[PDB]
Symmetry: D2
Subunit: 388 residues, 4 copies
């Protein structure tokens, strides 16, 4: 029987998944995806590509109704009629959105056709993760919608400029993405919440801090300068893991982001210093200048500018630590290639190989000293650079 | 070891998939999908939803370039710069597109960083299937993009009319979808190619034709099979092919432009081409089977009822209306049948219908269900046989 | 849960087994055995070796009670008390033998503690297969019981003689096994039934008869001489598969075996000719002289004698076809190595590699022309030999 | 492909076995065994039953030669002729034995036709485990070989007496097994080594000692634990090791020859050695736990009852008899607990007992079951706690 076979497959894959770590589970999940694609019929492939786009449209509707937050707090299964009446939604519309949501595990449907939270329901109720989904709907989707015609119009160029990519046609403007976003109040607020989403694991899981420090002394220097550090999660985790390391630990960002960070920052030990990383770096001779998920959002020439603003502040002991994606030369996975297409369409930037990172840093007069990977199989690493 | 466990999982699923039929493989594929969603991390969920949308956009770029057709014809792996130079694409952009494509199996990357066709490559090179991908990008995507704020602005109504749903907001018009497409020279040609993609399997694989014929005579000159809105007439062709000795007229009904397009692929005899708008009374009297495949799902109840009412006065006691369409279950419906429901709600104002909802609709037309013959699994397509009440 | 895991393993292995042929199932079964051995604890290994010997002792008890034949014909589950009363067995003894039998699948026990036939029950009810089990108990077991002390007494020799191996000590006689068996009425009868067990598949599944024949003509020669052919299954299958091939087809065996074969032989087309294969072969110039599972039961010197009795009867077109086990040089499996130990202990003989077969046939002046394997992964093959 | 499917099965089972505990692995192993029996052909069944008996005989030969101990010590693979020449075995015979051994994993054959130790090699080199294999060959095998014709000759009786079962026919004597072994200089030494094999896990892994102590005082000088027929005293050693601070005498009771043999391995203090035949009244009064591990299963009901009756008059209200033994289920019992039942029936006239049969036996001694603490799965061994009625 196929239902018996299918239940047995689920049981054994679940038992294998439970017995490995999060990296082994990510590898199993990538293999399940590749098996699905290789096994589908030609018609299934067209259907899958046609319909998987429903997921984020329906998630955005659930978010606007407050459905995922509400269902996450319910202690018992809820009927479609109870959800519809509580949330201000038409009853037949609510019933057919829940039926779609249950079919892709956005919620769970019970045997008596009621609804409970799934793991995905809990995810979409988290503010930072909800904001990532809403960001995909309102900012990424229109740009991907414009990419095919944009490339055809321009005879398939190598996109290298943030001010002439798919973004400009999608939103009918000559501004680049980041500047245009800063003039849109509702989108600014959503990105503010997006910053509260802390990625796990982080670089401190594999970064050999003591061996990189060596005999460095804080005789009143900065140990860690978090450039564009957002909520300062890197500073918070650093002070939490090495609470007796001397040296200033400084969060650098724009004033509005720094204000939103004050609530969750510790009252002691981490300075909030407003700084635009398109300007010369004010902190001189720091041990670590840290750039996490910054340079991936800029083309080569402006990513170079950012590093050139830091280099004149470095001493011989100073290091620029680039914490970012490092996809492989071969066999890159969908999370790191889909990234690449999205940031080319919206920002004109790109993901870069280890060899691509080294070539960019050499234009700044830097040399790679060490690379400390901390996620698998999609590669994120802390890359430590020195003066040439 | 982690690599060897992954490779062992792949080998065992492959072997199990090879050990069953297409319905068993579709069930396995749905199970693998369920497993993925249940095992992803919270961040993976958001990433998956953010990035899976790239597949349709990049497929449209590859279709614009003719990449899929070209690589399908290739006998040896090709480098990114060979592909770029041949198709007229920037070398950097081509390498980035191929890397993404390979990551989602839209093509395959070899150990030497060259590229081969995959099953998906082959699929996207087929014109009828290519056209469904292009239809989803240019027609379905804008409607889904407009749906959330349409529902918000309108305070989440129950959509029931084809001229007031998300489609009107998405394309800034007041026509319904089918009217509007007819006035669009840009998009009609793709819809015409879409009719050429014959779905497999079809209802004849399980339809007990001889049993359903029962006490019915083709004499003197009666119609066996009237295929209402039959498009290219696939149903008529497969019917004559499977039952070449059964007497009776076999009639393809559609609009004159579609019938003209069907002439190239119809047999020279045995199948009549009859122009007929199914919003008017059915002209063929007393046929055995009045056949409607994937017609009624595109209409709200009121218009779907009128289409059935156009047929009923032509029926004799031994006539049957055969509705060949999706029949999702009361619970546990699959993503392919719920996804379609959202899409046709947003574009057409219509809906998928359960067996009970089909019977309720047909009751208003004075019909009763005599039999239901499923022919796909686990997503249910079925030939439903209705008679006069 | 372990019961859910264990049920899922069963489901998936069963589905894989159903989807291959009998050779793939044999390979899966060998892998399950090797996995069991590698996974057991040290205590499990001693227990397994201690207790798996119960299986054939309890099978012999079930055979003597007629239990397997009786249960094979029952249309409903039977209680231990009903089986005990019907078969003339003590009720508590019957209950604990059935509990042991059910634990090793010799029968199946139901949820309400009744008993039904298993696949193994049906097997043990077949006369020829029952006789194989009874043969293992009464003839093989005592010889294996004597092998360790026999080898120690004699300082671990290379056993090469049928008249001085473990058999002589086990049954306290100086006769060789076959001669001693012929003086034991009850054992003669059991081997008579053992001959009715036809092995499947057989050599005709892969033997290219027409291409081996070539232009041979029966102008009034024998096509097939089945030497020690037993019930003549090889002759029956040959006439059934090639019913229009001209040439005599002759079953050669001892008179008592030939009598028992007459019942099941066709009335036409197969001659029954009494012949002792330790004597010169009477049929001259036949196309195929066929020896299936004969030479494995003799040491080299008497296996050579048997072939030397046939060679002077051959023409240039004649072939000796040895149908027997051909184990590999490396990675031989338990069915073909356990064989080897048993026949060395009882008969002084051995299994032989392809290279070992060629060297034996060369002493007879024969050369291997072709080898047609027909079972996997345990190798049985029809080996075709020509005059040197 | 058939090879790759086999290799994938092996990898997945290995990974599942590694992903659970020893009890999960024992369940997996029983499942693999069930699968094999259900998937074998009729001819395979007969072959398996014919040939699996070779394993014990060949293990005994390897033990006689010291093969398992030698290969266990070896740092590199060894050829058959190196092994033959070193152990004093004919080169032909050695190669044939090793080929068979490798086929059942008793050692492993390398790709270059050389031989390494396996887990089973290691096992058979351990003296206590070696001794169980030798015991099965020389003591159990002759009794099983005599059982069928013994039952036939005697018209299939219910065996209930230790001096009239298959053992008397197998060894042509009228003594019971335990008496007869004591008069056999050949076989006593192996039985002595058998006592040194400590089973794992043991009852202390789940026994809630502090809970069972309850309202009981070691003062003034009471006994915590009396291990009746305790052999080498493993139970006493592990008890003092796990509960080093719990007060009370810990007493090992056995026959003087076994106690002498236990002296080498006992701690210098904390455990008393008390000669005592458990067929006589128990001398230690008012102990908390009177412990009987794998004692009573070797006796028919009548003698097992007498052993319990020897203990009851020594008990106080807070005293408990702890029977540590096998407790097979009412249905679905495993081969390791049913196989033992046949073996001890044939040699000792005794039996395995379900929980209900244990309670019935103890009721005749005036005892009631207070608690049962299982410590192995799926084959059930349990510490059963009995109190006065
Ligand atoms: C990827 S987000 C947060 C990255 C941060 N390193 C982390 O891992 O959480 C990029 C950050 O850069 C900040 N940013 C953007 N433009 C900036 C600028 N010109 N100067 C300083 N920070 C800027 C944003 O406020 C945002 O917090
Ligand atoms: C889903 S498509 C083809 C369905 C077809 N039965 C099949 O299974 O291939 C719907 C068909 O209905 C036709 N159609 C649309 N409106 C129609 C009308 N008013 N009268 C007749 N046919 C119509 C279209 O031309 C198209 O061929
Ligand atoms: C392995 S059994 C049957 C083999 C037979 N080729 C088959 O495949 O069924 C061996 C046969 O050889 C026969 N046999 C034993 N000694 C013989 C002899 N001296 N002359 C002729 N046949 C003999 C026995 O009667 C028995 O039928
Ligand atoms: C199964 S062995 C050892 C059991 C021990 N409780 C254990 O778990 O290791 C049985 C023990 O009972 C002892 N024994 C046999 N007869 C006895 C008797 N009459 N009185 C006391 N001990 C006896 C033997 O010496 C042997 O040590
Ligand atoms: Cl026909
Ligand atoms: Cl303690």
């Amino acid at each position: 029987s196929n239902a018996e076979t299918v239940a047995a497959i689920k049981t054994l894959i679940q038992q294998l998944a439970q017995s490995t770590d999060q990296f082994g589970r990510a590898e199993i999940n990538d293999a399940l995806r590749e098996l699905q694609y290789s096994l589908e019929t030609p018609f299934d492939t067209v259907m899958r590509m046609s319909l998987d786009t429903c997921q984020v449209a329906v998630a955005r509707i659930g978010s606007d109704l407050g459905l995922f937050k509400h269902l996450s707090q319910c202690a018992s299964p809820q009927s479609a009629e109870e959800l519809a009446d509580h949330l201000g939604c038409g009853r037949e519309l609510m019933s057919r959105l829940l039926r779609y949501m249950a079919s892709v595990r956005m919620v769970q449907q019970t045997d008596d056709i009621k609804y409970i939270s799934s793991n995905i329901t809990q995810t979409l109720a988290v503010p930072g993760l909800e904001a990532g989904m809403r960001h995909a709907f309102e900012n990424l989707w229109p740009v991907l919608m414009a990419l095919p015609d944009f490339l055809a119009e321009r005879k398939y160029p190598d996109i290298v400029d943030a001010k002439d990519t798919a973004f400009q046609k999608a939103f009918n403007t000559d501004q680049d993405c980041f500047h245009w976003l800063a003039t849109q109040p509702t989108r600014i607020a959503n990105f503010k919440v997006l910053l509260t989403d802390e990625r796990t694991p982080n670089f401190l899981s594999t970064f050999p801090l003591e061996k990189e420090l060596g005999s460095w002394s804080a005789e009143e220097k900065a140990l860690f300068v978090d450039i564009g550090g957002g909520m300062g999660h890197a500073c918070i985790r650093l002070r939490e893991k090495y609470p007796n390391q001397p040296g200033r630990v400084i969060l650098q960002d724009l004033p509005p982001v720094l204000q939103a960070a004050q609530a969750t920052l510790p009252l002691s030990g981490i300075e909030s210093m407003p700084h635009n990383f398109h300007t010369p770096q004010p902190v001189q001779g720091a041990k670590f200048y840290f750039l996490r998920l910054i340079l991936r959002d800029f083309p080569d020439h402006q990513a170079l500018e950012i590093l050139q603003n830091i280099v004149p502040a470095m001493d011989a002991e100073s290091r620029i630590v680039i914490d970012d994606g490092v996809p492989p030369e071969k066999g890159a996975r969908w999370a790191e290639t889909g990234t690449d297409i999205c940031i080319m369409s919206a920002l004109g930037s790109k993901e870069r190989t280890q060899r691509q990172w080294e070539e960019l840093a050499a234009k700044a007069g830097l040399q790679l000293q060490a690379l400390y990977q901390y996620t698998w199989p999609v590669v994120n690493a802390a890359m430590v650079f020195s003066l040439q």
